[PDB]
RNA sequence: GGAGCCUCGGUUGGCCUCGGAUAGCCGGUCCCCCGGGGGUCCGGUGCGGAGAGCCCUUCGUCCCGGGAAACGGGGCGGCCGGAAAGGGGGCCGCCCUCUCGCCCGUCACGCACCGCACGUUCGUGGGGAACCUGGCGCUAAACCAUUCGUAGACGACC
């Protein structure tokens, strides 16, 4: 019942709009891999667009002023916070159903990630525009853990290739098995074809 | 690189619109994003359909670029698209998507029990292939 | 020994932008995402099932702690999947985003 | 309107929340960035500010007016009795910072260090680390600590060591020692751990951590002066004599 | 004139009122392009009142009919002569298109002038729609379709139905 | 408008042996091997002809600015063919007036030392680009030849030392001192 | 590790994971080269080694037959793999256990509660009180007061 969303290749706003609706409808969502998110427009434009956000502090006391979070997960958590009525109870009750992370933590790397193609970069952009990786943008603003996550995410990659190689083999037999029991699943494969399941 | 070219006489499927699920042949290209199309032996009147609402296949049939329905029909039946089409892996998994869509509830039960026993013979067999895989490795 | 209702989330009331009419509830049923799919659900009896502290007598059973608010699907709402419902008591606002059941039994099949 | 003549602001905003420090003992904010090239060593020590005096020495900066002459420089004395390694802590590299992985201590801890784990030593029964002291006398515990060590060789990156001072050697009034994590910078993690495990329960003199004619940083707590007005904290101009409500 | 929907073409003829001074006035035929015949007969008076001294109070519509396409299944190269107004002065244009019906081309011309020059429908005066051959074409954007052996693929495909399986698992292929 | 098709073939001689994995092209021959990425240009790279004598790029439905990217591949891939069968030789002349530019190369043509530029005490130690091999030529006094394969490296490294020896806060018309690129050529003729 | 009494509630089959390209991919064969990667060839691609998907499927039983199972079904001890915010995941012996489990068929039975609602779950849920029963356990600290003066308006701090 837990939407696990992969941020690799998702546009920031188009994804945050879809996430914010589901969170408002009692759906517990986790947006994994926030550094793969990419904003439209060229990189130097987006950096300026974020540097002007760093310049808006309360003049008399910056300690109360707008908290410019630098981590990509908290940047994406910030833009979702914009699209929710976070002043009311149902808004604050919503945001607790949202949990964002950089990289893929242990409670989620062994689960299947979803993809929202209505917010996908390959879909929603003409293949001539430029886009800014949220990871690179956040690092050049103060996210001081880009190097760490780049190895922790790389670590769980090769730990997943092991599982995948042990999964193709775990089904290459299954393809080879039916070729070895063909005569005794013949009466169960024809019914699995006349009702459009194995054709 | 590209394999399917929008050119005169390529058979195409149809995604949406009132002509969905039928084949239709491209007579001539009108605009950048709209083509004149005609499936004579498919209950599709000659008309113009934009490229959004069509998925071009890998069938080609030759005829001049602005012939009338009389000549296309003789070129549709010469290459005999209909029989070849229904023998493709595309149309086979198209007529299998509708065989699951009209599945009655009792048919849904006959396919439940049929699936249950076919997931017990395959599963036990692959279990036999595992106790023999470390046997041949140890 | 199985579920006999469809899952439906109570989105909100029939509102404008600065007025909400609490005698009507917008329902989001799972799976249905177009007006042409709501034809099956028009008229179906829906139910918001909750549980409270005190005990309530139960039709055909012992006094439990669960209580319901019966309603019905009135007409299709919006252009994609949503639908209006009308309950015998205007739904409490603490049910926003919570699961309410729509049954099958007033069926037209 | 604008300010007539410019003038630089008083005080620094870098050291801004000028409050009573939340730590009596100086706390190393940052340690030197390690590299496997150098051999294993410590990076910090702990001392006590004794007093000050002069020094006469020969200046040897070619080019100065004072070159090859004698000067008198004020020098501080830092009494540094040798410190006792009593434990090692591991650290893993997280994307949320630097988390502490696993702590190991010594089989026997001096009562100086055990002073620190109590607020009232007179009333306490001095029961700290007793059952931990009985974890090195059991085959189910020696293999436990072997697990804790063999785990830090895999998952720990930064290994800091736990050392304490020797208040008995000092002339001071108090006897409660000072604990400190000291980042062991050196080779790889494994030899950083074998070296640290062997140094357990041993004294460490300053010659192991500092040489002479070297340049170091001092971390500590300012000599507290109490509640002070604006003139003492920031040194802003005293108002002219004629002011009614204070100057 | 709000260029709404697909336009149509109307042959509307009119004349002055019969008077004892002039027995029977001459007949005036036009070719109007309008959404419905009602706004066709209104747009008719707009032109005839500037090519003649006639107004609706001193004229009568004689025939308000719709003309259909002679060959709606043939692709044709249409030539349109415009009179649109910009923010500064009016201009004559000759725009070329490629469509199946003249009304299909006139509509296309109205969307294009609104798109390429931000001119609204009340500023444009279509004056001539002529069917020309492939050799008399001048605009290059239509000459490129003159090939008996035209051949071109479909490039990177903008995936539709991107909301029906809103939360997929697979990355959507764009190479068909 | 959008042009239906614009292509440009590139005939290659036999000494080269091109193979391409998708939209990146690798080129090899006598002098070494080259490899450039083009996953930013969105074209069709089709390698046609038996015994592979010509490579063609395509662009369907491209506007003006995309059609300007069709030939710049054909130019970029031709300079790979030069940098594999003939190589690149950038000649540079150190022109001075009063102070002889003492230039010495270290580590077999990978670092450039520039001393006594305009009579200064600074050494403009310039790091070359990997793949470039610099040297001073014999039978010519004030020369500096650059060799290598990739034109994007032999030229950019040249631009380093040509912009390392710049006069500041003077009249650059009077103070013509510095190193300048004098000849762009190939290592060997054919 | 046993039953009951309060209180807070929401839910009502699970999906155990390549990386990523998108003017390109995916799986096999390995005829192939260097210690896993490349190349090759054969297949698939409006993805069917498809989330438009998969898996599990629950009325309970009792005799008998057919297919499938024998390596299976269920159990007490050990062992390894696991650290970004770490499975009650898997391997071996074990006394017992069964041709029962699933699919086709028979035999008959299980309040057939007399047309009607909160039914069917996760559920030994969370929390808090009292009681059961045994075992294995465990016998501290903080604050005040006092003293200090590296501290201090009083608190605080050493």
Quote the tokens at residue A173. Answer: 């037999």
In contact, B21 and B14? CB cutoff 8 Å = yes
The answer to whether the Cβ–Cβ distance between A122 and E172 falls below 8 Å is: yes
A2 touches strand G (CB under 7 A): no
Quote the tokens at residue D207. Answer: 């010659």
C and D in touch (3+ CB pairs within 8 angstroms): no
Quote the tokens at residue A65. Answer: 């002023």
Write the DSSP symbol of residue D32: P
Chain E: residue nearest B10 by CA? E151
Beta strands F33-37; E8-16: pairing state: unpaired
Residues 6+ apart with CB under 8 A from B36: B26, B27, B28, B29, B30, B46, B47, B48, E73, E75, E100
Quote the tokens at residue E20. Answer: 């004892």
A197 part of contact set with chain B, CB < 8 Å: yes
The rounded distance, in Å, linking the Cα atoms of F41 and A127 is 9
Matching residue, tokens 């600015």: F65
Beta strands A28-32; A98-100: pairing state: parallel
D159: number of Cβ within 10 Å: 25
Chain B: residue nearest E97 by CA? B31
The answer to whether the Cβ–Cβ distance between E154 and B51 falls below 8 Å is: yes
Core vs surface per residue B56-68: b (16+ CB within 10 A) or e: bbebebebebebe
Quote the tokens at residue D112. Answer: 């100086």
The answer to whether the Cβ–Cβ distance between A25 and C11 falls below 8 Å is: yes
- Write C9-18 long-range contacts (CB < 8 A, 24+): C9/A25, C9/A26, C9/C97, C9/C98, C9/C99, C9/C100, C10/C48, C10/C91, C10/C95, C10/C96, C10/C97, C10/C98, C10/C100, C11/A25, C11/C82, C11/C96, C11/C97, C12/C96, C13/C91, C14/C77, C14/C84
Burial (CB count <10 Å: 0-12, 13-18, 19+), residue E86: exposed
**Sign of the dihedral through C-alpha C4, C6, C7, C9:** negative
**Strand pairing partners for D204?**
D83
Picking from F155, F156, F157, F163, the residue whose alpha carbon sits closest to that of residue F183 is: F155
A103 touches strand G (CB under 7 A): yes
Write the DSSP symbol of residue B135: T
Residues 6+ apart with CB under 8 A from D58: D68, D69, D70
Matching residue, tokens 């009249």: F171
SS3 for chain C is: CCCCCEEEEEEEEEECCCCEEEEEEEEEECCCCCHHHHHHCCCCCEEEEEEEEEEECCCCCCCEEEEEEEEEEEEECCCCCEEEEEECCCCCHHHCCCEEEECCCCCCC
D62: number of Cβ within 10 Å: 7
In contact, F129 and F156? CB cutoff 8 Å = yes
Measure, in angstroms, how far nucleotide G125 C1' is from residue E164 CA: 36
Quote the tokens at residue F164. Answer: 């390392």
Q: Name the residues in A55-84 having a C-beta closer than 7 Å to nucleic acid strand G.
A: none
- Max Cα-Cα span within chain C: 45
Reported in sequence order, the residue ranges of chain F that DSSP labels E, i.e. its strands, are 8-11, 19-21, 24-28, 33-37, 44-48, 54-58, 88-95, 102-106, 111-115, 126-127, 133-135, 143-148, 178-185
Q: Is F32 left (phi over 0), alpha (psi -120 to 50) or beta?
A: left
Picking from B24, B76, B72, B68, the residue whose alpha carbon sits closest to that of residue B48 is: B24
In contact, F107 and F128? CB cutoff 8 Å = no
Residue B92 — φ and ψ, nearest 5°? -65, -40
Quote the tokens at residue F69. Answer: 């990217």
The rounded distance, in Å, linking the Cα atoms of F183 and F92 is 7
Picking from A180, A181, A198, the residue whose alpha carbon sits closest to that of residue A189 is: A198
Beta strands A2-6; A28-32: pairing state: parallel
Which H or E run includes A178?
helix A146-178
DSSP string, B49-95: EEGGG-EEEEEE----TT--HHHHHHHHHHHTHHHHHTTSHHHHTTH
A150 part of contact set with chain E, CB < 8 Å: no
Residue E99: its chain B contacts at CB < 8 A? 30-31
The residue count for chain F: 190
The answer to whether the Cβ–Cβ distance between D93 and A152 falls below 8 Å is: yes
* Gap between the terminal Cα atoms of chain F: 44
Measure, in angstroms, how far nucleotide G6 C1' is from residue C53 CA: 11
Angle, CA B42 vertex, CA B39 and CA B48 arms, to 5°: 35
Chain A: residue nearest F42 by CA? A127
**Strand pairing partners for E78?**
E97, E131
Which H or E run includes B27?
strand B24-29
Matching residue, tokens 């690799």: A8
In contact, F185 and F154? CB cutoff 8 Å = no
In contact, D219 and D26? CB cutoff 8 Å = yes
Coil, helix or strand at residue A84: coil
The answer to whether the Cβ–Cβ distance between A25 and C28 falls below 8 Å is: yes
The rounded distance, in Å, linking the Cα atoms of B121 and C5 is 34
Quote the tokens at residue F8. Answer: 């440009």
Comparing CB atoms, the residue among E144, E150, E156 nearest residue F3 is: E144
The answer to whether the Cβ–Cβ distance between E160 and B52 falls below 8 Å is: yes
Residues 6+ apart with CB under 8 A from B58: B3, B4
Burial (CB count <10 Å: 0-12, 13-18, 19+), residue C54: exposed
The rounded distance, in Å, linking the Cα atoms of E14 and E36 is 18
**Sign of the dihedral through C-alpha E19, E20, E22, E23:** positive
The rounded distance, in Å, linking the Cα atoms of B33 and E13 is 37
D102: number of Cβ within 10 Å: 16
Q: List the nucleotides on chain G closer than 7 A to a protein CB.
A: 7-25, 27-29, 38-39, 44-59, 67-72, 83-87, 102-104, 116-120, 139-145, 148, 150-153, 156-158
E175 part of contact set with chain A, CB < 8 Å: no
Angle, CA A44 vertex, CA A40 and CA A49 arms, to 5°: 70
The answer to whether the Cβ–Cβ distance between B32 and F2 falls below 8 Å is: yes
Measure, in angstroms, how far nucleotide G31 C1' is from residue A172 CA: 22
**Strand pairing partners for A3?**
A29
Nearest residue to nucleotide G15, by CA–C1' distance, is A112
**Sign of the dihedral through C-alpha E119, E124, E129, E133:** negative
A21 touches strand G (CB under 7 A): no
The answer to whether the Cβ–Cβ distance between A115 and E170 falls below 8 Å is: yes
The answer to whether the Cβ–Cβ distance between B1 and F2 falls below 8 Å is: no
**Sign of the dihedral through C-alpha A57, A61, A62, A64:** negative
C88 touches strand G (CB under 7 A): no
User: What does each C-alpha distance from D202 to D18, D83, D128, D164 come to in angstroms?
Assistant: 39, 8, 21, 11
Which H or E run includes B115?
helix B105-128
Residue D58 — φ and ψ, nearest 5°? -100, 115
Residues 6+ apart with CB under 8 A from E26: E15
Chain B: residue nearest A185 by CA? B118
Q: How many Cα neighbours within 13 Å face the side chain of F49?
A: 14
Picking from D125, D128, D107, D106, the residue whose alpha carbon sits closest to that of residue D117 is: D128
The rounded distance, in Å, linking the Cα atoms of D242 and D240 is 6
Breaks (C-N over 2.5 A) in chain D follow: none
The rounded distance, in Å, linking the Cα atoms of E14 and E52 is 12
Measure, in angstroms, how far nucleotide G61 C1' is from residue B125 CA: 31
Coil, helix or strand at residue E57: helix
Which nucleotide has the shortest C1'-to-CA distance from C2?
Answer: G120
DSSP string, D97-125: EEEEEEEEE-SS--HHHHHHT-S-TTT--
The rounded distance, in Å, linking the Cα atoms of D52 and D70 is 19
The rounded distance, in Å, linking the Cα atoms of B65 and B83 is 24
Nearest residue to nucleotide G141, by CA–C1' distance, is D124
Quote the tokens at residue D92. Answer: 């893993």
**Strand pairing partners for A5?**
A31, A114
Chain B closest CA to A187's CA: distance in Å?
8
**Strand pairing partners for D203?**
D84
Matching residue, tokens 């436990």: D144
The rounded distance, in Å, linking the Cα atoms of D47 and F89 is 65
* Among A18, A23, A25, the residue to mutate for chain C (most C Cβ within 10 A): A25
Task: For the sheet with B10-13, list strands across it.
Answer: B47-50, B34-38, B24-29, B10-13, B55-60
Chain B: residue nearest F46 by CA? B1
In contact, A30 and A99? CB cutoff 8 Å = yes
Angle between helices B105-128 and A146-178 (to 10 degrees): 100
The rounded distance, in Å, linking the Cα atoms of D113 and D177 is 5
The rounded distance, in Å, linking the Cα atoms of F110 and F127 is 7
The rounded distance, in Å, linking the Cα atoms of C30 and F155 is 63
Burial (CB count <10 Å: 0-12, 13-18, 19+), residue E41: middle
User: What does each C-alpha distance from E37 to E11, E31, E77, E102, F113 come to in angstroms?
Assistant: 10, 12, 26, 16, 86
B102 touches strand G (CB under 7 A): no
Which H or E run includes D158?
strand D158-164
Picking from E135, E157, C98, the residue whose alpha carbon sits closest to that of residue B6 is: E157
In contact, A30 and A130? CB cutoff 8 Å = no
Quote the tokens at residue A10. Answer: 């998702």
* Gap between the terminal Cα atoms of chain E: 43
In contact, A196 and B96? CB cutoff 8 Å = yes
**Strand pairing partners for E77?**
E98, E132
Picking from B50, B59, B60, the residue whose alpha carbon sits closest to that of residue B15 is: B50
F91: number of Cβ within 10 Å: 16
Q: Name the residues in D103-132 having a C-beta closer than 7 Å to nucleic acid strand G.
A: 118-120, 123-128, 131
Angle, CA E125 vertex, CA E123 and CA E130 arms, to 5°: 145
Which nucleotide has the shortest C1'-to-CA distance from B120?
Answer: G102
Burial (CB count <10 Å: 0-12, 13-18, 19+), residue A99: middle
Q: Is A142 left (phi over 0), alpha (psi -120 to 50) or beta?
A: left
In contact, F29 and F16? CB cutoff 8 Å = yes
Q: How many helices (H) and strands (E) does chain F have?
A: 3, 13
Beta strands F126-127; B24-29: pairing state: unpaired
Burial (CB count <10 Å: 0-12, 13-18, 19+), residue F142: middle
SS3 for A92-157 is: HHHHCCEEECCCCCHHHHCCCCEECHHHEHHHHCCCCCCEEEHHHHHHCCCCCCHHHHHHHHHHHH
**Sign of the dihedral through C-alpha B95, B97, B102, B107:** positive
The rounded distance, in Å, linking the Cα atoms of B53 and B12 is 10
Burial (CB count <10 Å: 0-12, 13-18, 19+), residue E83: middle
* Gap between the terminal Cα atoms of chain A: 31
Comparing CB atoms, the residue among B29, B47, B52 nearest residue E145 is: B29
User: What does each C-alpha distance from B110 to B114, B117, B123, B124, F16 come to in angstroms?
Assistant: 6, 11, 20, 22, 64
C96 part of contact set with chain A, CB < 8 Å: yes
Burial (CB count <10 Å: 0-12, 13-18, 19+), residue B38: buried
DSSP string, E91-154: --EEEEEEESSHHHHHHHHHHHHHHHS---GGG----EEEEE-TTS---HHHHTT--TT-EEE-
User: What does each C-alpha distance from D62 to D68, D71, D72, D73 come to in angstroms?
Assistant: 8, 15, 18, 19
Write the DSSP symbol of residue D178: -
* Gap between the terminal Cα atoms of chain C: 23
Residue D240 — φ and ψ, nearest 5°? -65, 160
F and B in touch (3+ CB pairs within 8 angstroms): yes
Angle, CA C53 vertex, CA C50 and CA C54 arms, to 5°: 105
The answer to whether the Cβ–Cβ distance between E163 and A118 falls below 8 Å is: yes
Which nucleotide has the shortest C1'-to-CA distance from D25?
Answer: G158
The rounded distance, in Å, linking the Cα atoms of A134 and A31 is 14
Beta strands E151-153; B5-7: pairing state: antiparallel
**Strand pairing partners for F147?**
F89, F133
Write the DSSP symbol of residue A191: T
The rounded distance, in Å, linking the Cα atoms of F155 and F149 is 10
In contact, C85 and C46? CB cutoff 8 Å = yes
The rounded distance, in Å, linking the Cα atoms of E107 and B109 is 56
């Amino acid at each position: 019942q837990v939407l696990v969303l992969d941020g690799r290749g998702h546009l920031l706003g188009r994804l945050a709009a879809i996430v914010a609706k589901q969170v408002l409808l009692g759906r517990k969502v986790v947006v994994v891999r926030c550094e793969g998110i990419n904003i439209s427009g060229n990189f130097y434009r987006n950096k300026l667009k974020y540097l002007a956000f760093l310049r808006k502090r309360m003049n008399t006391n910056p300690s109360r002023g707008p908290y410019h979070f630098r981590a990509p997960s908290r940047i994406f958590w910030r833009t979702v916070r914009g699209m929710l009525p976070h002043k009311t109870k149902r808004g604050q009750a919503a945001l607790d159903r949202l949990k964002v992370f950089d990289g893929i933590p242990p409670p989620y790397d062994k689960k299947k990630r979803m993809v929202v193609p209505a917010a996908l970069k390959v879909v929603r952009l003409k293949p001539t525009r430029k886009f800014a990786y949220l990871g690179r943008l956040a690092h050049e603003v103060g996210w001081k853990y880009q190097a760490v996550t780049a190895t922790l995410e790389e670590k769980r990659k090769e730990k997943a290739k092991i599982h995948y190689r042990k999964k193709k083999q775990l089904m290459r037999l299954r393809k080879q098995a039916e070729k070895n029991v063909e005569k005794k699943i013949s009466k169960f494969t024809d019914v699995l074809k006349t009702h459009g399941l194995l054709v | 690189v590209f394999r399917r070219f929008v050119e005169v006489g390529r058979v195409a499927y149809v995604s949406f619109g009132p002509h969905a699920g039928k084949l239709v042949a491209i007579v001539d290209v009108i605009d950048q994003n709209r083509a004149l199309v005609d499936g004579p032996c498919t209950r599709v009147r000659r008309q113009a359909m934009p490229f959004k609402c069509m998925q071009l296949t890998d069938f080609i049939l030759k005829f001049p670029h602005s012939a009338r329905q009389k000549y296309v029909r003789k070129a549709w039946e010469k290459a005999d698209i209909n029989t070849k089409w229904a023998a493709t892996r595309w149309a086979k998994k198209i007529e299998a998507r509708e065989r699951k869509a009209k599945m009655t509830d009792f048919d849904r039960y006959k396919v439940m029990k049929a699936k249950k026993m076919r997931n017990r013979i395959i599963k036990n067999e692959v279990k036999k292939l595992q106790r023999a895989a470390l046997l041949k490795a140890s | 020994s199985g579920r006999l209702w469809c899952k439906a989330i109570f989105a909100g009331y029939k509102r404008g932008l600065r007025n909400q009419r609490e005698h009507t509830a917008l329902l989001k049923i799972e799976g249905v995402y177009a007006r042409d799919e709501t034809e099956f659900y028009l008229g179906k009896r829906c139910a918001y099932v909750y549980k409270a502290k005190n005990n309530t007598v139960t039709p055909g059973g012992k006094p439990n702690k669960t209580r319901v608010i019966w309603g019905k699907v009135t007409r299709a709402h919006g252009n994609s999947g949503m639908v209006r419902a009308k309950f015998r008591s205007n739904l409490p606002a603490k049910a926003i985003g919570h699961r309410i059941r729509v049954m099958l039994y007033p069926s037209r099949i | 309107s604008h300010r007539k003549f410019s003038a630089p602001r008083h005080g620094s905003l870098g050291f801004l929340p000028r409050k009573r420090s939340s730590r009596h003992r100086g706390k190393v904010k940052s340690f030197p960035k390690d590299d496997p090239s150098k051999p294993v060593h410590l990076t910090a020590f702990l001392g006590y500010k004794a007093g000050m005096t002069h020094i006469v020495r020969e200046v040897d900066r070619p080019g100065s007016k004072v070159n090859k002459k004698e000067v008198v420089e004020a020098v501080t004395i830092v009494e540094t009795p040798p410190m006792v390694v009593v434990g090692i802590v591991g650290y893993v590299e997280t994307p949320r910072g630097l988390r502490t992985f696993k702590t190991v201590f010594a089989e026997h801890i001096s009562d100086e260090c055990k002073r620190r784990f109590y607020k009232n030593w007179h009333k306490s029964k001095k029961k700290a680390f007793t059952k931990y002291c009985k974890k090195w006398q059991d085959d189910a515990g020696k293999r436990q600590l072997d697990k804790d060590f063999s785990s830090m060789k895999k998952y720990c990156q930064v290994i800091r060591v736990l050392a304490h001072t020797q208040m008995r050697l000092l002339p001071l009034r108090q006897k409660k020692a000072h604990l400190m994590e000291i980042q062991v910078n050196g080779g790889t993690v494994a030899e950083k751990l074998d070296w640290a495990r062997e140094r357990l329960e041993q004294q460490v003199p300053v010659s192991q951590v500092f040489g002479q004619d070297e340049m170091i940083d001092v971390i500590g707590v300012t000599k507290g002066k109490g509640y002070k007005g604006v003139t003492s904290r920031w040194h802003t101009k005293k108002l002219p004599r004629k002011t009614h409500r204070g100057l | 004139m709000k260029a709404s929907g697909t336009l149509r073409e109307y042959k509307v003829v009119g004349r002055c009122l019969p008077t004892p001074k002039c027995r029977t006035p001459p007949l005036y035929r036009m070719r109007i392009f309008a959404p419905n015949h009602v706004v066709a007969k209104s747009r008719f008076w707009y032109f005839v009142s500037q090519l003649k001294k006639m107004k609706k109070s001193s004229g009568e519509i004689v025939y308000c009919g719709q003309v259909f396409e002679k060959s709606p299944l043939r692709v044709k190269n249409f030539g349109i002569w415009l009179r649109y107004d910009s923010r500064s002065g009016t201009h004559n244009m000759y725009r070329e298109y490629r469509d199946l019906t003249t009304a299909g081309a006139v509509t296309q011309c109205y969307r294009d002038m609104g798109a390429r020059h931000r001119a609204r429908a009340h500023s444009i005066q279509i004056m001539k729609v002529e069917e020309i051959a492939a050799s008399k074409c001048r605009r290059p954007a239509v000459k490129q379709f003159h090939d008996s052996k035209i051949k071109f693929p479909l490039p990177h495909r903008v995936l539709r139905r991107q909301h029906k399986p809103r939360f997929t698992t697979k990355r959507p292929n764009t190479f068909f | 408008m959008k042009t239906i098709l614009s292509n440009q073939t590139v005939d290659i001689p036999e000494n080269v042996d091109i193979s391409l994995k998708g939209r990146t092209v690798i080129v090899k021959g006598p002098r070494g091997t080259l490899r450039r990425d083009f996953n930013h240009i969105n074209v069709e790279l089709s390698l046609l002809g038996k015994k592979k004598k010509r490579l063609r790029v395509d662009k369907w439905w491209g506007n003006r600015k995309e059609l300007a990217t069709v030939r710049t591949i054909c130019s970029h891939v031709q300079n790979m063919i030069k940098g594999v069968t003939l190589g690149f030789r950038y000649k540079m002349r150190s022109v001075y007036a009063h102070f002889p530019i003492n230039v010495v190369i270290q580590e077999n043509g990978s670092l450039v030392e520039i001393r006594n530029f305009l009579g200064e005490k600074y050494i403009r130690r310039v790091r070359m680009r990997p793949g470039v091999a610099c040297s001073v030529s014999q039978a010519q006094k004030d020369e500096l030849v650059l060799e290598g394969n990739d034109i994007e490296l032999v030229s950019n490294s040249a631009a380093l030392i040509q912009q390392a020896t710049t006069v500041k806060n003077k009249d650059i018309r009077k103070f013509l001192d510095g190193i300048y690129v004098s000849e762009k050529g190939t290592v060997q003729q054919a």
